[PDB]
């Protein structure tokens, strides 16, 4: 047993309350090097004939990456309070993992030598608004959805679908025009719409705010957002909107003062000024996003602008109802602030999801004192390095989704935002080089993959684009000209992940075939529920052996119907070049 | 290299900001496994062709405990953002670290392979109050410390010191006492006093809370306590005084309504009651501190309790200008209320010291937005194995010392409280058998290291006593019962400490000696500065060599003042049983 590979600390995702009577630990170990593992547990106070009361507890692996095994175990501390440690097991070796270190035979005269969770509180649970897990959104950026205003169409603005667009083009989309084909997507299955900025700004992304209380005139009026969003809801569809605290635009009134005024300026203290007067040549005395000179970075410490950014959080809550809050460059921001987000927000509508955009590892954000979720970057670029590029094995997709999912808690994965696309990135199609097989593949399984997934306009039927600006071309409405399979396939998907619970709220886990080369198996389980999915990821047919216990199942295929039973031969299923397949599980 | 034992993830520990502008970062490895390791660092948006901007810093081993190497970085981001990797050599042999796994080639088409600090932000800084880095605590258990006014003493007192402390025995210790022992404080260096539960209570340790409105009667009044942190301040001692805010006591009004009305009562939700009415038979039907009936749980969620608590901690701050708070059992309550806690606490008084006593692993409540720091007993336990029981070797004594010191950031590490016993522990003297040389080498050791020591009353003297109740006995004021040798030692390290900032604020670490059981060397060094301490953990004399490279090089024997330079002639000193000596080095 390699110690050093061993390792387990008290919090985040090794440690913590799943409800408020139960906690859950996970302990790292090195690949195959341990046999089993067994949680030593007991309240930190009871002790009889002079010995402390502990109990053995033995512990699941529920998945491994390139380097580690994880394994996991709930328990339920009698009086809410739990010292414990980890018992491991290889050959007649024998390890006890302690905080104090390693030890070969459990001590017992001192409870100092575990590790501990203090109590369970209810307060300190991480709960995210649970309806959004059972959502599947559509992200769209307006300027390119459809102009159901011309009236109010920006000037200049091209006819739709004319040509590519160009980082200052406009195509005069509109609020209107989503209100105009809700019906689109109400029946594409929808249930959920993530909307980029739609406040006052010049730009055609309107990233660079001007007025966070005035929804840009190009797109509609407060009167249209809020017919929108009252539409949107008797559809049933939860509506989204982006917020960009992290920088104002060029044109946000307090910095134009500060620009005019100097030093002297009322808000001079709004922003992240080096020196006065503000300069922009060489190049800007003062933070930005980025390097862009259009977007300085606000000072959300400051109490002005703290109770600035608050209020325009609240607002559009309180006079329009919106179901959540998409916070751009989120991780830029002090985790002062995001606290006090979170309570301000929470306290008005509790069921409003806190979405955080963070491009990479987002632990401290997630602790339940902020963000209710966080994009889903990683996930976007394992799902496409194995379905779209081609570029790692089924085994590598296996150890990368394992790794990203067990470096958070459950129920945070539970409520993540995965996504296979934005207006920041290039298409799916695309990055599948024009393959619709592999596309086909990607949304199977982010639709059949646990969280709260969002697709990008137009994705579904096959829209094409590099990155930024090629991605945000017009939203094809020509039936002559969108992928009518994809768009099926899709509708097809988004049903069988309302009908199987299992789908949205499961826990995942990867068969290994003798070739994890090109053949992917994994299921979905939401305790009672059970899919399998297979999937023949390469240009050859193939007959993939399924393995599984074949006493007392029966499997159902989600695609034809079709039924069936599994004798002592394992079935072998057949799929034709980058085919699938998703089997119910049934045991009798 | 072994990848299994590589570890670093951007958070706590092993990435936080140190300052407005600084960073620091960890990465651990396997023991001896690499060689040396440098920080691929660069701003996220620092572009030029389809290559991120980075540049190689290296990173020095700071220390090593058991298992691994910790390797460190300093760095001040260019425009506070920061994306990073590690680059790890073996006999320069590259291997790429980053948050997408390891490579053997760095990444360069994309900053999103690399671990992430988003940015510095002021306002997330961890910050203790600045004074405490340099205090020196004399904790006081005030029934036991010196009886300055007979007229309050419980009926019953028995004649001070002469009896063995009871659970419940009473002698007379009061407030008055303390301030009349004041000049013994100031004389021994001591520059701040943590005070044991005051306020009123029937037993006579007092953590079963009465009224935390009111000092016990048998103590004195509020006029006696102004006068003794008046006085105290007008020396230049700050006071902390204890919080048993996780349970109240059994005469606690609001709980002798729930135990009379019942389930009518009022305060029902200030406890944490299962069934109605209340019992105490096979156990008590409502939590409490243990199992101990005479200490209810108190229900810090509900808003009332919540309300309380929080006016006692800022009634007594405001009133009377203590200058901490010591924290009882403060992991049992939840984190929502110690984030308000200090919200209100900081904002009454930003240089108050917020201390929980949390006796383990407390990285949680040591993050920024709750606690300055919590008793750190894990030192008290490394240290009293080796110096008091001699059960490890000083390699391992080291190894312990650098792993506790490796989980937490600097800035948490150097407001840490270091004590050696307390009230709910052996006698350090006990604990050593009885040999004073080795209770001198826990005080120099002590004296020593970073953070805010703190001594218990007697532990100066050589009192002793097992554990609770017999480390409580009453103070030994006749110093024919005094050991003096000792007063005037720890009298003579708490002047030595408060001469060197390298002391007291920093650097430490362990240099390899030649018989790695009984002699221990380590330096502290603040870059300035830096003190060399040899000592030798044996019952028989030794000729130990001291580690430095002469050039340049003059030790000034800190004890004598002895000084002499460094030459291959004169670096070995020679030491008597427990024997010690500290150096001043000065590099010319
Ligand atoms: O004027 C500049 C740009 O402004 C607008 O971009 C927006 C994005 O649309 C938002 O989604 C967001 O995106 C940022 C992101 O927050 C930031 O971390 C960074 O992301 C990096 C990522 O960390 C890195 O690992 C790698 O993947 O590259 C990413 C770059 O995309 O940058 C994103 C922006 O590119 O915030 C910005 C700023 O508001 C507008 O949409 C753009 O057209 C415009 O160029
Ligand atoms: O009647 C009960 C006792 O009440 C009083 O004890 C106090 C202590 O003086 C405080 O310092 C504190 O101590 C707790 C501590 O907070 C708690 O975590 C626990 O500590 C254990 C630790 O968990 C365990 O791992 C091991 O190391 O032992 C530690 C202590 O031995 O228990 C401590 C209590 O001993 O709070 C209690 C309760 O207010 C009173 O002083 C005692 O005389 C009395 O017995």
């Given amino acids: 047993m390699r110690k050093e590979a061993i390792y387990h600390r008290p919090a985040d995702n090794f440690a913590y309350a799943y409800d408020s009577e139960t906690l859950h630990l996970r302990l790292r170990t090195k690949k195959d090097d341990i046999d089993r593992v067994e949680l030593l547990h007991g309240d930190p106070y009871d002790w009889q004939n002079?010995?402390?009361?502990?109990?053995?507890?033995?512990?699941?692996?529920?998945?491994?990456?390139?380097?580690?095994?994880?394994?996991?175990?709930?328990?339920?501390?009698?009086?809410?309070?739990?010292?414990?440690?980890?018992?491991?097991?290889?050959?007649?070796?024998?390890?006890?993992?302690?905080?104090?270190?390693?030890?070969?035979?459990?001590?017992?005269?001192?409870?100092?030598?575990?590790?501990?969770?203090?109590?369970?509180?209810?307060?300190?649970?991480?709960?995210?608004?649970?309806?959004?897990k059972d959502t599947v959104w559509?992200?769209?950026?307006?300027?390119?959805?459809?102009?159901?205003?011309?009236?109010?169409?920006?000037?200049?603005?091209?006819?739709?679908?004319?040509?590519?667009?160009?980082?200052?083009?406009?195509?005069?989309?509109?609020?209107?025009?989503?209100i105009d084909h809700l019906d689109y997507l109400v029946d594409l299955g929808i249930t959920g719409i993530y909307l980029t900025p739609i406040f006052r700004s010049p730009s055609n992304h309107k990233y660079d705010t001007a007025d966070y209380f005035e929804?840009?005139?190009?797109?509609?009026?407060?009167?249209?957002?809020?017919?929108?969003?009252?539409?949107?809801?008797?559809?049933?569809?939860?509506?989204?909107?982006?917020?960009?605290?992290?920088?104002?635009?060029?044109?946000?009134?307090?910095?134009?003062?500060?620009?005019?005024?100097?030093?002297?300026?009322?808000?001079?203290?709004?922003?992240?000024?080096?020196?006065?007067?503000?300069?922009?040549?060489?190049?800007?005395?003062?933070?930005?996003?980025?390097?862009?000179?259009?977007?300085?970075?606000?000072?959300?410490?400051?109490?002005?602008?703290?109770?600035?950014?608050?209020?325009?959080?609240?607002?559009?809550?309180?006079?329009?109802?919106?179901?959540?809050?998409?916070?751009?460059?989120?991780?830029?921001?002090?985790?002062?602030?995001?606290?006090?987000?979170?309570?301000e927000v929470k306290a008005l509508k509790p069921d409003v999801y806190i979405l955080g955009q963070i491009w990479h590892d987002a632990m401290p954000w997630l602790r339940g004192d902020q963000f209710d979720a966080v994009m889903n970057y990683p996930f976007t670029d394992g799902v496409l390095r194995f379905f779209a590029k081609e570029e790692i094995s089924a085994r590598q997709f296996?150890?990368?989704?394992?790794?990203?999912?067990?470096?958070?808690?459950?129920?945070?994965?539970?409520?993540?935002?995965?996504?296979?696309?934005?207006?920041?990135?290039?298409?799916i199609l695309t990055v599948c080089g024009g393959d619709i097989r592999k596309v086909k593949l990607l949304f199977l399984f982010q639709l059949t993959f646990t969280g709260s997934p969002c697709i990008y306009y137009?994705?579904?039927?096959?829209?094409?684009?590099?990155?930024?600006?090629?991605?945000?071309?017009?939203?094809?409405?020509?039936?002559?000209?969108?992928?009518?399979?994809?768009?099926?396939?899709?509708?097809?998907?988004?049903?069988?992940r309302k009908q199987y619970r299992s789908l949205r709220r499961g826990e995942i886990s990867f068969l290994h075939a003798d070739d994890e080369m090109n053949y992917l198996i994994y299921k979905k389980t939401d305790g009672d529920e059970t899919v399998l999915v297979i999937i023949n990821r390469s240009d050859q047919k193939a007959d993939i052996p399924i393995p599984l216990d074949a006493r007392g199942t029966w499997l159902v295929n989600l695609l034809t119907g079709e039924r069936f039973a599994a004798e002592a031969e394992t079935l072998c299923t057949s799929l034709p070049p980058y085919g699938f397949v998703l089997y119910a599980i049934e045991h009798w």
Avoid at 468 to 484: A, G, L, Y
Wanted: hydrophobic share 35%; aromatic share 16%.
């Fill in 50 to 132: 002079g010995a402390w009361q502990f109990q053995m507890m033995p512990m699941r692996k529920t998945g491994s990456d390139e380097l580690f095994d994880y394994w996991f175990a709930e328990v339920k501390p009698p009086y809410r309070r739990l010292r414990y440690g980890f018992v491991l097991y290889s050959g007649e070796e024998k390890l006890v993992y302690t905080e104090k270190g390693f030890y070969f035979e459990v001590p017992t005269d001192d409870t100092a030598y575990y590790f501990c969770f203090p109590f369970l509180h209810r307060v300190d649970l991480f709960e995210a608004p649970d309806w959004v």
């Fill in 138 to 178: 559509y992200q769209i950026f307006p300027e390119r959805f459809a102009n159901g205003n011309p009236s109010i169409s920006p000037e200049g603005s091209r006819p739709w679908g004319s040509e590519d667009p160009t980082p200052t083009s406009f195509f005069g989309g509109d609020l209107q025009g989503i």
């Fill in 215 to 343: 929804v840009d005139p190009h797109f509609g009026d407060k009167e249209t957002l809020k017919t929108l969003i009252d539409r949107c809801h008797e559809k049933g569809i939860r509506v989204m909107l982006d917020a960009v605290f992290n920088h104002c635009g060029y044109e946000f009134a307090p910095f134009q003062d500060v620009w005019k005024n100097g030093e002297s300026s009322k808000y001079k203290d709004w922003f992240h000024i080096h020196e006065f007067p503000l300069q922009t040549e060489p190049r800007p005395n003062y933070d930005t996003f980025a390097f862009v000179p259009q977007m300085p970075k606000l000072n959300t410490a400051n109490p002005e602008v703290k109770r600035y950014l608050l209020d325009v959080a609240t607002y559009w809550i309180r006079e329009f109802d919106i179901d959540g809050w998409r916070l751009d460059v989120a991780n830029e921001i002090d985790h002062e602030f995001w606290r006090e987000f979170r309570q």
């Fill in 398 to 427: 296996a150890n990368q989704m394992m790794h990203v999912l067990h470096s958070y808690p459950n129920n945070v994965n539970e409520a993540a935002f995965n996504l296979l696309g934005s207006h920041d990135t290039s298409r």
């Fill in 458 to 496: 137009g994705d579904e039927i096959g829209m094409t684009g590099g990155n930024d600006p090629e991605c945000r071309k017009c939203m094809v409405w020509d039936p002559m000209q969108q992928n009518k399979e994809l768009h099926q396939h899709v509708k097809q998907l988004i049903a069988l």
